[PDB]
Design a protein around this ligand. Structure first.
Ligand code: ZN
Length: 46
């Protein structure tokens, strides 16, 4: 019913690039890696 699981709390460590909310900082970074253009891109995603 609801788009994804997004409860309440503190998600200030969200990706300022795309806008993804993670549980912790370590998670955010591990993701921001896809923004540095280092990893091998695949499908079309903004
Ligand atoms: Zn991002």
């Amino acid at each position: 019913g609801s788009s994804g699981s997004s409860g309440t709390g503190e998600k200030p460590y969200k990706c300022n690039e795309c806008g993804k909310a993670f549980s912790q900082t370590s998670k955010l970074a591990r993701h921001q890696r896809i923004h540095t253009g280092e990893k091998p891109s695949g499908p079309s995603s903004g």
